[PDB]
Structure formats: structure tokens, C-alpha cells
Amino acid sequence: QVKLQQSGAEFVKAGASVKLSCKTSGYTFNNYWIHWVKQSPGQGLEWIGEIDPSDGYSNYNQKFKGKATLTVDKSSSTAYMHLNSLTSEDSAVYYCTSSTSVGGSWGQGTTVTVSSASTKGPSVFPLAPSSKSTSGGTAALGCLVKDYFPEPVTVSWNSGALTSGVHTFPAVLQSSGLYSLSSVVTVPSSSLGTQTYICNVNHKPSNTKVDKKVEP
Amino acid sequence: SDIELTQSPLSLPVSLGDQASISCTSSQSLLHSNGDTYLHWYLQKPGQSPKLLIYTLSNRFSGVPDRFSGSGSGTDFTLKISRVEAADLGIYFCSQTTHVPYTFGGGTKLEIKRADAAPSVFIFPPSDEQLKSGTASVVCLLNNFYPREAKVQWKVDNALQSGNSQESVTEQDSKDSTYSLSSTLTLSKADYEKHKVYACEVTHQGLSSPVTKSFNR
């Protein structure tokens, strides 16, 4: 069973370096080449380079030469990629891949977030229902979860009990370097003030849990 | 320079059980000196890594369903899915490993087709709680629409707002195959207090003409 097991998420400052790793098993490590691939919103999928573990020979995409360095540790059957002089352009998911010959499976990916920001819990603001949020017999309400770092935050509604019509949107990165996200739900218009609505917000990186009631 | 792979279409709506066909063309021949053509097809599901379906043009990767087939002529390539299932939904990528540097196409999204659904549009003024703190976020919600394409335009006392809003969109809904979208307009408390009419104008294929939702503070 070929398994490629990548290291965990990285959060580093511009100018820093990171060493990502990819532990392999279920094939003869020394007989097949390892590749690394970048996936970013800005550039899609990009091949970084390849390394032959047998003699350590490596070959790069000229776009990443001296940005990225490939090595292996044969005792552990682990591949590594060192990334240096990081910029926000390097914030991406990085995959490690095996040869098509051993199945050409890809690791899970490792997310690298390059940022000056420090850990910060969100403020939670209501998005109250009104006439402005009522299309006939359905009303929308929600929570604005603002100014946190890093991702992620979780949001449930009424302590897991409300899930129908919930939309928790992807976070956006604000020009301040902090994230912001909305979670909304549509409900029967007639339920308002009879049924209470609470958004349960959790931001584990800062240990910030908030239950926020949302009413007209 | 580097080999460019161009995929078509960008987005492919299908109904479950339809046949799907996706195209990839190369700016150079992908025939290697060894006689092989190193053009490969991958499927990436949301939050997952790319998975290899077809390698070297037409070789079905061991354990990939028979309904995936690869074809093509040295520079024009095609992936066919004979009976589309829910497991097949996501982004399909072609890639080439004939010539260094290896390169990828831009992806084709295979999504569920449904009837046009106009968005339900809702606008939320900033909360008094937030105003105390010193910022004003105005949120416009476009709920349960299809197709994905939607234009949101913010107006503050008829001043078209540009560069001071951010949008976010959900993945296609499991049940109803719709999208939802939130757009946040960020102002200072000071600026927010200077104006009266906040308007979110929504342009969508499913609407007669663009709808506007506003409030006056």
C-alpha cells in the first residue's frame, strides 16, 4: 500500500524559511523519483522539481531554482522540500508525489501561510433579520466573524441543532492581514422571536469560543 | 518557453448519468523520443489532493472506473466520462511530463446542471456593536442561485464602490445544486455616518433585470 504522509500546516513570517516533509511507505523508496507540486489561487498547479533518491540527482523548474531545495532521508524514506526567503506569493498548498510506476499517488498537501500577523481571536457581530432580510415568508440572519488570525474558525447554529439552510462562507483575507467570514441561515419568517438563534463560534488557535444570540 | 496546456470548457454542467467530454490542447507535441505521450488526467475533489485517472494519454490507472477513457492526437486530447456520478464531480486537470518543466492545464470544473434559479437577495446594515468598535461592514447575501455567474455592485449615495468589498461563494449545494454568495463592503464608522443610501445591486441570468436591495440609515 503506497502511502505518502505530508507534514502539518505552516505559519511563518515573510523572509523566513520552512522545511516540508513527506514520509513514504509501501514501496522501495530508493527506486522511484519524488516530485513536488505547488497549488495557488494565483498560478494554479505548478511543478516545482523532481529528485532521484538513489543518487540524489535533482532537476528543477527554473521558476523555483534556489527558492526550493529537494532532499531525501533514506533511513526514514522521507522526502523534504526546503523553501527560503518566503513572500506572500509562496502562500500555497504544496504536494509531494510518487511515480506513476508506484501508482503516482499524491500526498495530502501541506498548507504554507506567509504572514506578518499574530494570533488573534475574532469579534462576532450579528446579522439581524429585518424586512431587508425577508423575501416573503423566509428570513435570513447570520453572524459576521471578523478580524481573526489564522484560519480556521468554526461556526454552528443552535449548538449543532440547526443545519438546514446554513451557509458558512469561505473566509476572505482582508488587506489588514486578518480574516473575515460570514455564516448565514434562512428560517421561516414566522419563527422570529419565538425561536432563539445562536451562532456558536470557535477559533481554536486563540482559544476563543463565543456564543452569540441573533435577534430582530 | 514552457508548454502551455489549454483546457476546454472552463466549466462543464452535466446531469447525473450524462456523458461528459473534456478537452486539453498542448502548445507543443507531447510525443517523447521513447514513443510514449506523457499527457495525464487528474480529478481533484474539493479539499482533496489531485487523483490520477488516466496516464500517458489513454492508460486507465489500476482501480479507476472503466467509464473514464482518454484519447487524442499528439497535441489535442480528450477525457470522456460515459455515465457521470456524484463521485466524479470536481476539477479535472491535464498535465504533461514529456518536457521539463512539467506543466498543468488550468482545470475544468465538472458540476451539476439545474434550472436557472434567481438569487434571493438580502442586505444587512452594520451592527451597532460593530459601530462602537469603529468599523462598518455592510453585508449583501445572494442565496441559492444558479448558474454561478453573478455580479454584485455596491453603491453608497449612488457612488459606485470599487476595491473596498470582498466576495465569498459556497460550493454547489448537495441537494439543490445552487450556489450562495456573501459580499462585504467595508467602511470607517466616520464614512458610514456621512452617507444615507446603501445599495447592493445584483445582476444574474435568472433575474428579469438587475435587482437592488438598499437601506437608508
Short mmCIF file of C-alpha atoms in Angstrom, two decimals, chain A:
data_model
loop_
_atom_site.label_atom_id
_atom_site.label_comp_id
_atom_site.label_asym_id
_atom_site.label_seq_id
_atom_site.Cartn_x
_atom_site.Cartn_y
_atom_site.Cartn_z
CA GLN A 1 0.00 0.00 0.00
CA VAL A 2 1.81 3.12 -1.17
CA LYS A 3 1.30 5.88 1.42
CA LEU A 4 2.62 9.48 1.18
CA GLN A 5 2.16 11.28 4.52
CA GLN A 6 2.88 15.03 4.48
CA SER A 7 3.79 17.34 7.40
CA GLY A 8 1.33 19.76 9.03
CA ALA A 9 0.30 23.35 8.22
CA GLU A 10 3.00 26.06 8.44
CA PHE A 11 2.53 29.64 9.62
CA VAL A 12 5.63 31.82 9.08
CA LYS A 13 6.72 35.40 8.53
CA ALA A 14 7.94 36.94 5.27
CA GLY A 15 11.67 36.31 4.96
CA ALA A 16 11.57 33.08 6.98
CA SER A 17 12.19 29.56 5.68
CA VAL A 18 10.25 26.25 6.03
CA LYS A 19 11.11 22.60 5.56
CA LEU A 20 8.14 20.49 4.46
CA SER A 21 8.35 16.72 4.67
CA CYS A 22 6.68 13.71 3.14
CA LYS A 23 7.04 10.31 4.80
CA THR A 24 6.62 7.43 2.35
CA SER A 25 5.97 3.70 2.73
CA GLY A 26 4.72 0.61 0.85
CA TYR A 27 7.32 0.74 -1.93
CA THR A 28 11.09 0.61 -2.37
CA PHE A 29 11.97 4.27 -1.64
CA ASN A 30 15.27 4.26 -3.49
CA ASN A 31 13.91 3.13 -6.89
CA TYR A 32 11.46 5.96 -7.76
CA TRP A 33 11.59 9.69 -8.22
CA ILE A 34 9.76 12.16 -5.96
CA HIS A 35 8.15 15.34 -7.24
CA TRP A 36 6.81 18.43 -5.55
CA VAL A 37 3.89 20.49 -6.87
CA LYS A 38 2.53 23.91 -5.83
CA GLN A 39 -1.17 24.86 -5.95
CA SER A 40 -2.10 28.52 -5.52
CA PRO A 41 -5.09 30.63 -6.48
CA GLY A 42 -2.82 32.94 -8.48
CA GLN A 43 -0.98 30.32 -10.57
CA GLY A 44 -2.95 27.01 -10.39
CA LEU A 45 -0.87 23.83 -10.35
CA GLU A 46 2.86 24.24 -10.88
CA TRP A 47 5.51 21.60 -10.96
CA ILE A 48 8.47 22.57 -8.73
CA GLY A 49 11.02 19.85 -9.29
CA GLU A 50 11.98 16.21 -9.03
CA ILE A 51 14.59 14.24 -7.09
CA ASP A 52 16.07 10.79 -7.64
CA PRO A 53 16.63 9.30 -4.13
CA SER A 54 19.17 6.72 -5.50
CA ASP A 55 21.92 9.27 -6.24
CA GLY A 56 20.22 12.46 -5.01
CA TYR A 57 20.15 13.91 -8.52
CA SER A 58 17.62 16.74 -8.78
CA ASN A 59 16.02 18.76 -11.53
CA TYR A 60 14.04 21.95 -11.11
CA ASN A 61 11.51 24.21 -12.75
CA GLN A 62 13.66 27.25 -13.42
CA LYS A 63 10.87 29.30 -11.82
CA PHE A 64 11.73 27.68 -8.41
CA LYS A 65 15.56 27.06 -8.58
CA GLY A 66 17.07 28.47 -5.33
CA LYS A 67 13.57 29.03 -3.90
CA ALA A 68 13.05 25.30 -3.34
CA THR A 69 15.52 22.63 -2.39
CA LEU A 70 14.76 18.91 -2.57
CA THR A 71 16.39 16.32 -0.36
CA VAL A 72 15.66 12.83 0.98
CA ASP A 73 16.38 10.91 4.23
CA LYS A 74 16.69 7.30 3.21
CA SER A 75 16.64 5.82 6.75
CA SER A 76 13.08 7.17 7.23
CA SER A 77 12.06 7.09 3.50
CA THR A 78 11.14 10.75 3.85
CA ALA A 79 11.31 13.42 1.18
CA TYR A 80 11.77 17.06 2.07
CA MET A 81 11.40 20.37 0.46
CA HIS A 82 13.02 23.46 1.88
CA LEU A 83 11.54 26.81 0.89
CA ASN A 84 13.55 30.00 1.59
CA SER A 85 13.05 33.74 1.59
CA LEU A 86 9.29 33.43 1.82
CA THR A 87 6.86 36.03 0.46
CA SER A 88 3.04 36.13 0.31
CA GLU A 89 3.49 34.63 -3.21
CA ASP A 90 4.67 31.40 -1.55
CA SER A 91 1.44 31.04 0.48
CA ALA A 92 0.04 27.90 -1.15
CA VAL A 93 -0.61 24.19 -0.81
CA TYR A 94 2.41 22.03 -1.55
CA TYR A 95 2.09 18.43 -2.64
CA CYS A 96 4.63 15.67 -2.74
CA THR A 97 4.07 12.93 -5.32
CA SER A 98 5.34 9.48 -6.21
CA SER A 99 5.99 7.98 -9.66
CA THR A 100 3.08 6.73 -11.84
CA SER A 101 5.05 3.41 -11.61
CA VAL A 102 4.21 3.10 -7.88
CA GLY A 103 0.71 4.47 -8.60
CA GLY A 104 1.55 8.20 -8.94
CA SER A 105 -0.41 8.99 -5.77
CA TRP A 106 -0.07 12.38 -4.20
CA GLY A 107 0.31 13.31 -0.56
CA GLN A 108 -2.42 15.19 1.23
CA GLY A 109 -0.78 18.54 0.70
CA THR A 110 0.78 20.91 3.21
CA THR A 111 -0.55 24.46 3.50
CA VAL A 112 2.03 27.22 3.96
CA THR A 113 0.67 30.62 5.09
CA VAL A 114 3.19 33.52 4.85
CA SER A 115 2.07 36.43 7.05
CA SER A 116 3.29 39.15 9.40
CA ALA A 117 0.11 38.75 11.54
CA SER A 118 -0.08 37.30 15.06
CA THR A 119 -2.73 35.08 16.53
CA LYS A 120 -5.94 36.93 17.20
CA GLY A 121 -9.43 35.78 18.05
CA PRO A 122 -12.40 37.23 16.12
CA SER A 123 -15.06 39.72 17.08
CA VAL A 124 -18.55 38.29 16.45
CA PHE A 125 -21.27 40.63 15.21
CA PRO A 126 -24.88 39.73 14.46
CA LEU A 127 -26.52 39.99 11.12
CA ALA A 128 -30.04 40.64 12.39
CA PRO A 129 -33.14 39.78 10.40
CA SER A 130 -35.38 42.63 9.25
CA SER A 131 -37.75 43.45 6.35
CA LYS A 132 -34.49 44.00 4.40
CA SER A 133 -33.69 40.32 5.09
CA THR A 134 -37.27 38.94 4.42
CA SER A 135 -38.25 37.69 0.92
CA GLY A 136 -41.97 36.95 1.54
CA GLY A 137 -42.15 34.06 4.03
CA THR A 138 -38.40 33.40 4.51
CA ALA A 139 -35.96 35.49 6.59
CA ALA A 140 -32.15 35.44 6.56
CA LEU A 141 -29.93 36.09 9.58
CA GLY A 142 -26.31 35.38 10.42
CA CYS A 143 -23.08 36.18 12.20
CA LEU A 144 -20.14 38.23 10.91
CA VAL A 145 -16.95 36.68 12.32
CA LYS A 146 -14.31 39.40 11.86
CA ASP A 147 -10.59 40.11 12.32
CA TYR A 148 -9.06 36.76 13.31
CA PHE A 149 -5.76 35.05 12.51
CA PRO A 150 -5.05 32.39 11.40
CA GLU A 151 -7.73 30.22 9.80
CA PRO A 152 -9.90 28.42 10.65
CA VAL A 153 -12.95 29.38 12.67
CA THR A 154 -15.87 27.09 13.13
CA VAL A 155 -19.50 28.16 13.31
CA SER A 156 -22.54 26.12 14.25
CA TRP A 157 -26.13 27.32 14.83
CA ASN A 158 -28.19 26.48 17.94
CA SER A 159 -25.46 24.16 19.21
CA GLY A 160 -25.49 21.82 16.17
CA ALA A 161 -29.29 21.60 16.22
CA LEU A 162 -29.83 23.95 13.24
CA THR A 163 -28.24 22.90 9.91
CA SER A 164 -30.92 23.24 7.23
CA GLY A 165 -30.32 26.42 5.20
CA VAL A 166 -26.97 27.21 6.91
CA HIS A 167 -24.26 28.68 4.63
CA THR A 168 -20.83 29.22 6.19
CA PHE A 169 -18.83 31.05 3.53
CA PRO A 170 -15.11 30.76 2.86
CA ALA A 171 -13.11 33.31 4.80
CA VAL A 172 -11.64 36.29 2.96
CA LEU A 173 -8.19 37.72 3.67
CA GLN A 174 -8.57 41.45 4.40
CA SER A 175 -5.90 43.99 3.45
CA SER A 176 -5.14 44.23 7.20
CA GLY A 177 -3.83 40.62 7.14
CA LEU A 178 -6.73 39.36 9.22
CA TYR A 179 -9.54 37.08 8.06
CA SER A 180 -13.27 37.75 7.99
CA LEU A 181 -16.17 35.32 7.44
CA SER A 182 -19.95 35.30 7.45
CA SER A 183 -22.25 32.41 8.41
CA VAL A 184 -25.90 32.81 7.47
CA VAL A 185 -29.14 30.85 7.79
CA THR A 186 -32.62 31.17 6.24
CA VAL A 187 -35.57 30.36 8.53
CA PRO A 188 -39.39 30.59 8.46
CA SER A 189 -40.28 34.29 8.84
CA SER A 190 -42.94 33.41 11.46
CA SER A 191 -40.35 31.78 13.78
CA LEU A 192 -38.62 35.11 14.66
CA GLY A 193 -38.68 35.98 18.41
CA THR A 194 -40.45 32.64 19.15
CA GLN A 195 -37.33 30.63 18.21
CA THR A 196 -33.95 31.88 19.52
CA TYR A 197 -30.98 31.74 17.11
CA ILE A 198 -27.42 31.46 18.43
CA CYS A 199 -24.21 31.17 16.36
CA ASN A 200 -21.55 29.13 18.16
CA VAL A 201 -18.21 30.47 17.02
CA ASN A 202 -14.92 28.74 17.81
CA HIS A 203 -11.37 29.89 17.00
CA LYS A 204 -9.08 27.24 18.45
CA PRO A 205 -5.77 28.89 17.59
CA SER A 206 -6.56 31.70 20.06
CA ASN A 207 -8.85 29.63 22.38
CA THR A 208 -11.76 32.00 21.57
CA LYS A 209 -15.24 30.46 21.93
CA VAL A 210 -18.29 32.74 21.61
CA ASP A 211 -21.98 32.04 21.55
CA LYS A 212 -23.79 34.99 20.03
CA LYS A 213 -27.55 35.44 20.04
CA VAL A 214 -29.03 36.91 16.91
CA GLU A 215 -32.44 38.58 17.05
CA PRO A 216 -34.50 41.34 15.37
#
